[PDB]
Amino acid sequence: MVKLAFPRELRLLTPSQFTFVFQQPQRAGTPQITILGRLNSLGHPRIGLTVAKKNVRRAHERNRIKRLTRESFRLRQHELPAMDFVVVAKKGVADLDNRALSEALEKLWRRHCRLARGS
Numbered sequence: 001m002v003k004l005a006f007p008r009e010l011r012l013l014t015p016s017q018f019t020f021v022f023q024q025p026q027r028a029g030t031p032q033i034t035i036l037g038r039l040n041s042l043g044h045p046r047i048g049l050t051v052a053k054k055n056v057r058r059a060h061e062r063n064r065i066k067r068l069t070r071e072s073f074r075l076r077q078h079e080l081p082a083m084d085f086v087v088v089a090k091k092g093v094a095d096l097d098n099r100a101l102s103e104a105l106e107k108l109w110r111r112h113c114r115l116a117r118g119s
Contacts, residue, residue: 004039004119018048021086028112030104032092035112038084047073048086056094065089068101072109079113 014020017038025036049069056062069087073080096104 017046017084018050018086021048021084025086026115028115029087029108030093030111032090032095033104033108034088034090035108036086036088037112037115038086040084041082042084043082044084045080045082046084048084049089050086051089052091055089055091058094061094064098064101065093068105072105076109079109079116081116 020040021036021038025038027034028037029035047070049066051062051065056065069089073085093104
């Protein structure tokens with residue numbers, strides 16, 4: 001609802017981070033590339049970019065997408081917290097130009113950054 005700390009910590013949670021993030025992900029990102037946010041202070045910041053073959057149909061550009069995302073998360077280490085970030089690239093992110101990939105980077109960056117400073 002408002003407070004991210006739910007009393008379900010008294011309940012047996014699953015160690016499945018993929019499931020855990022997908023249950024309650026704070027959606028902040030471009031409609032064609034969904035950067036989810038899992039409020040979890042583990043101390044282990046990981047980038048879990050998940051993409052389907054229907055979403056990125058161009059085989060080589062699949063590597064392009066994982067390049068763009070992962071290389072950004074390795075350089076924007078100041079802005080991101082130590083949480084679980086399973087990013088789901090939607091069908092359409094691979095419709096952009098190689099130039100436009102970087103052009104959309106600052107869009108999703110600032111988008112989620114504004115939310116990471118809030119709650």
